[PDB]
Design an enzyme around this catalytic site. Structure first.
Site, mmCIF file in Angstrom:
data_model
loop_
_atom_site.group_PDB
_atom_site.id
_atom_site.type_symbol
_atom_site.label_atom_id
_atom_site.label_comp_id
_atom_site.label_asym_id
_atom_site.label_seq_id
_atom_site.Cartn_x
_atom_site.Cartn_y
_atom_site.Cartn_z
ATOM 1 C CG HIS A 98 31.968 18.792 0.086
ATOM 2 N ND1 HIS A 98 33.255 18.636 0.561
ATOM 3 C CD2 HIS A 98 31.399 19.789 0.727
ATOM 4 C CE1 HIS A 98 33.481 19.577 1.452
ATOM 5 N NE2 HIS A 98 32.374 20.305 1.551
ATOM 6 C CG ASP A 139 -2.244 0.850 0.893
ATOM 7 O OD1 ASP A 139 -2.162 2.073 1.070
ATOM 8 O OD2 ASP A 139 -3.299 0.248 0.490
ATOM 9 N NE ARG A 195 37.364 28.727 3.804
ATOM 10 C CZ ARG A 195 38.361 27.969 4.282
ATOM 11 N NH1 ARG A 195 39.641 28.295 4.115
ATOM 12 N NH2 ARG A 195 38.083 26.868 4.969
ATOM 13 C CD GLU A 218 34.478 17.987 8.480
ATOM 14 O OE1 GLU A 218 34.990 17.811 7.343
ATOM 15 O OE2 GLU A 218 34.039 19.099 8.906
ATOM 16 C CD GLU A 227 34.339 19.237 -2.818
ATOM 17 O OE1 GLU A 227 34.822 20.355 -2.759
ATOM 18 O OE2 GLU A 227 34.675 18.315 -2.002
ATOM 19 C CD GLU A 237 34.051 14.462 5.596
ATOM 20 O OE1 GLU A 237 34.823 15.360 6.089
ATOM 21 O OE2 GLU A 237 33.438 14.587 4.481
ATOM 22 N NE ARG A 281 34.118 22.226 -0.797
ATOM 23 C CZ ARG A 281 35.326 22.239 -0.240
ATOM 24 N NH1 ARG A 281 35.891 23.389 0.090
ATOM 25 N NH2 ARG A 281 35.972 21.095 -0.048
ATOM 26 C CD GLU A 290 34.467 14.845 -0.012
ATOM 27 O OE1 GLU A 290 34.556 16.077 -0.119
ATOM 28 O OE2 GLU A 290 35.552 14.201 0.157
ATOM 29 C CD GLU A 338 31.546 17.685 6.445
ATOM 30 O OE1 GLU A 338 30.935 18.687 6.980
ATOM 31 O OE2 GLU A 338 32.555 17.789 5.675
HETATM 32 MG MG LIG Z 1 35.446 17.970 -0.145
HETATM 33 MG MG LIG Z 2 34.616 17.364 5.312
#
Ligand SMILES: [Mg+2]
Ligand SMILES: [Mg+2]
Ligand SMILES: [Mg+2]
Ligand SMILES: [Mg+2]
Lengths: 468, 468, 468
Positions: free
Chosen positions: C269, C49, C339, C213, C357, C220, C359, C128, C130
């Site tokens: 990420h 269901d 960053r 982390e 990547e 991580e 993030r 990745e 966390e």
């Molecule tokens: Mg990374």
């Molecule tokens: Mg990290």
């Protein structure tokens, strides 16, 4: 208002409490300064929003402050503040039953629909509302469960409990609180204060008698009978008094029926008489000095009783009281000298009084709506010459000669009572006293109460069903 | 000052409490000896530093002690002490707004601008601020988490809680608690005291009504309408009174909207009227007794509402009240008889004192800024003859006939309201009533509120996201 | 299924746990006997269901058991039970996304659409995720208010706390706890076990690294990249492993972003690569070894990012992580060594492992839905040759040219992200990978999350607004 405005002057009161009654029969209040209150205000009124009876309409009804009587200095509150328990609720135009229906106006309608019928000038009602006073009361309902607890020193089960002042051991045993002396009574002065407050409110005299009812913590104060729309107002005032006096004793009062299981419930017996030009028409010689009029009144009620129960017994809890027991007015019959008879004829010992007493109502009844409905049913009796049958004096609740089995009974559930009212609402609509729309609403609103009960698992179901 | 200085003499007061209002709408105070207060003080004023008003350099600003109407006697502090609830805040170079902007000055302006535009001599504001009183309130936020708890005897959920005097069981149900009698009401005496204190401050009359609002613990006291600036001063005084009286009952009062979830939030409806040569300009025959002037006023408000929200609803919390519940006046339209209508036209028995009510503002509004904003937007309507369109008398909400979908709404978040204000600030800048610099500051300062909320994880983000 | 059915034989398992994923990205399961499972099951499937989403006329939908990449021998439960981590949900008429839309199917759809466009044979994802592990976590929301509390020995605020075995004093400082040695780092041993369990589930290799982390209690574990669908299955399995291993330590794990405020939130990420004929399409010589293909992929993502956020950041909580800070990839741009840039190009050393990547996604992303939407947006880039613009590795937010205001940012709220998705869903609808109906549903479902947050007063609102 001659009464009110003058009272304001005499009291030097700065505040005037407008009090009205909702469909469910709960007094409500809003407070104004004396400055805004003029004689014209009784005509013009003060306007307000509608959030209990109505909705969606965005209703801006007016509180037409009613004037004669119900002009009582607020006994409990500090500042000098008279109350105007008389606040009929009027629509902006059609000065009429505001919201779905204002009970007080419905009752006023019925007042007229008695003189109009030419049956009678006035109708007299004398209710005997019973209440319990506890030290403290606690409950909660969650997903986790449902729970409720009664706490009182006078409670029958409080033997063995620890107390600050110590345990007196002097308390009513179960069912056995019928008038024992003060060591165990442990009220008296409280009831006295209640009585004193009543006199402050309604007037001198008016208070008949104060005694301890059967159940532990159960008390009864007697108030004089009066006309509808007067007595109805006084019912609300009575409730108010007892609530607040109790609160001043750090205790709590409830007019709910059967709060306590396995002791007596609280019931509101309604004594009724009709007068025409100041003669009680119930006087006669048909049954123990009853007029045919009275006999017809009775039996109209019996016919419409199940439907009447919606109004006279409007709480799911009411039907906890209406169970197979003696002194339980479950069986729809009449007898001056029979218990378990829904109707009794009190021994007036003098043709002047000649009341008839309906024991089936409970204090949850909206006084206005309730009294009215009884009258409508009563007069339908007279109008249609409905025979009340023959008075069953011999058997309260006992063997079935098929007869007692065949005897009709009051409603078993609010659910049933509402179904009854659906079927039989005609008598109410007479005189246009009750609009159909109001009845429609009422029924639906009360159904939510029924819904609650039916939806919420009861502790007892654990007892019965958990391990099956 | 004839009022103040004389009062000082009469009171034998040794101290004068100078009060002003910050950007965020919080009354602030500094206390000076009465010897320092001369007539020249009113002209020259007293100097002080800059906090909250975002003074930041050029810090030394001045408190122009004004004269309030019966500058409040202490009415709460120990020594007999007058407060000058009014103290306009004046810049070193010249006279007017200090730092970013003094709200009281902004409100002084805009009083003038109405006359300058020649549309009217005087503007009338009548706010209906709602508040809650709790027994106690606690909160904390750490790295560990974020937590807040409401504590009150009268709280609907307090059934079952333990108390010293023991649980009465007599308390409001949720949303119920619209005008029940005192056992349940509880706050009668307290409201009365609040009223008494108000009269001490603002003198006789001034107090229209006291009742219990819908939500458990929610109360409303009615205060008379007044001009801008004066009414703004009186709002602050009202808040002060209720806060302090509650404190004397060992309880706490909050004007925040929606402290309690799932019962009514606290809202500040603003009644508004424009008068010129002592005649109500809003009175007419266009709609339900409304002049075209009034209709135009309405239009402007509706047009600029989202931006107005930054001032009328300037708290993140405001938007907890402003929700899809049809209770919340989120829909931007007008009707005498519609609840969902952001604007309502109250029934005035007599055309004198025809008004319009804006129900969307909440007590978090800084009345000075905000009475102002309403006027500016209102007159933009009149100036541009902005037509409010049709009145939604018909339906608040249905199965969406599109229509309701198309119906304009207030703003969803303070975030959005601030974005709105950024886009639409022009009407405010007219008359130079609002400086751009003030608006720019306001926005940034209020953004920190938004930042807080949006940065801090909320308990519900655990309900939804923890196990995901 | 060769692998499943054989596994059943080898294990002597009596039970097969059929697992799928809901729209909201939460693994779900039903457990069936191995006797019930034949080769035909893989074709026909098992029926069940639908109350999860898309309540239909009726939801008789089928669980097409789907022989995973290593259907897990299971690891936590007692009786030997293989899980078929894959169970595509198939509609009775036809065989596709049942209900609104099975994420796994949607993801398969996107796998195929890649080859349909002929842009690539295979697409590779390496997320990745966390997580935090706490000793215990509590929360509640009532009318009383809202509260939530995080409890752990390792938590940096436990410096002064009382412990049975006695406080070590050795725990991470705030933000510190990036790779200190074990006396301070409580998670060696636990992470190890988590890794061991992962290997049980996904088989040897697969596990790249385990470290602590930054934030106290934040860990991580690194799992090798795989295809779409495969990797999405492995995301679910990873979550499962870490949850249950933590539970074996009597602790609790959450992949929610920002559970703890004022230390680092948890982010996922997503490393992304495309191949054709077993050749990395992303490798080239445009920028830091990037093909124009890759640069175009980037562009599409950046173009549709706000709408992508509904999928990549589908929790109100996500935006607690996406807050204006360093270490917070809010800015829509790309760099190798910068960053602040939502997209980063990881240092491969040897191409063929060339990736991009992103993030900005958090572990609340539905792996299936997320991976899919990234591809669709990516290929829209390539298809329309959408230029990613210049690489912003110049300078972070250190230099605001005021053009930084004009620099695009990710969505500020889920609310905004959902509005974004409404506007920009076209790329997804290509290939019929995403139905409009699915997106329409998704949006409405996630709106309830938004509703919750917006309706529920936050502790911090008390802090800001209570005493105002
Ligand atoms: Mg990374
Ligand atoms: Mg990290
Ligand atoms: Mg009795
Ligand atoms: Mg009796």
């Amino acid at each position: 208002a001659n009464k009110v405005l003058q009272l304001i002057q005499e009291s030097g009161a700065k505040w005037v409490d407008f009090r009205f009654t909702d469909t469910k029969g709960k007094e409500q209040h809003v407070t104004y300064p004396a400055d805004s209150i003029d004689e014209d205000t009784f005509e013009d009124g003060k306007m307000f929003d509608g959030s209990s009876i109505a909705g969606w309409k965005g209703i801006e009804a007016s509180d037409m402050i009613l004037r004669p009587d119900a002009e009582t200095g607020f006994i409990d509150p500090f500042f000098a503040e008279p109350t105007v328990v008389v606040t009929c609720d009027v629509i902006e135009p059609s000065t009429g039953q505001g919201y779905e229906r204002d009970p007080r106006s419905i009752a006023r309608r019925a007042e007229e629909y008695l003189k109009s019928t030419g049956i009678g000038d006035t109708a007299f009602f004398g209710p005997e509302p019973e209440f319990f006073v506890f030290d403290e009361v606690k409950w909660d309902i969650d997903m986790s469960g449902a729970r409720h607890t009664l706490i009182a020193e006078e409670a029958a089960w409080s033997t063995g409990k620890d107390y600050e002042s110590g345990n007196s051991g002097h308390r009513p045993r179960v069912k056995g609180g019928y008038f024992p002396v003060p060591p165990v009574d442990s009220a008296q002065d409280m009831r006295a204060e209640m009585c004193a407050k009543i006199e402050d409110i309604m007037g001198p005299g008016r208070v008949e008698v104060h005694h301890h009812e059967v159940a532990s913590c159960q008390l009864e104060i007697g108030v004089s009978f009066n006309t509808l729309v007067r007595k109805a107002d006084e019912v609300q005032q009575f409730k108010y008094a007892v609530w607040n006096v109790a609160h001043q004793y750090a205790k709590t009062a409830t007019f709910m029926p059967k709060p306590m299981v396995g002791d007596n419930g609280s019931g509101m017996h309604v004594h009724m008489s009709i007068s025409k030009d100041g003669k009680n028409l119930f006087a006669g010689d048909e049954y123990a000095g009853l007029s045919e009029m009275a006999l017809y009144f009775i039996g109209g009620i019996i016919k419409h009783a199940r439907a009447l129960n919606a109004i006279t017994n409007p709480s799911t809890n009411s039907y906890k009281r209406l169970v197979p027991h003696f002194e339980a007015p479950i069986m729809l019959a009449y007898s001056a000298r029979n218990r378990s008879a829904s109707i009794r004829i009190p021994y007036v010992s003098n043709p002047k009084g000649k009341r008839i007493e309906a024991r089936f109502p409970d204090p949850m009844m909206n006084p206005y709506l309730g009294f009215a409905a009884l009258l409508m049913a009563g007069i339908d009796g007279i109008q249609n010459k409905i025979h009340p049958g023959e008075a069953a004096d011999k058997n309260l609740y006992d063997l079935p000669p098929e007869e007692e089995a065949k005897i009709p009974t009051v409603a078993h559930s609010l659910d049933m009572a509402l179904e009854a009212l659906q079927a039989d609402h005609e008598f109410l609509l007479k005189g246009g006293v009750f609009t159909k729309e109001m009845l429609d609403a009422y029924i639906e609103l009360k159904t939510e109460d029924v819904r609650r009960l039916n939806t919420t698992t009861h502790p007892v179901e654990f007892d019965m069903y958990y391990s099956l």
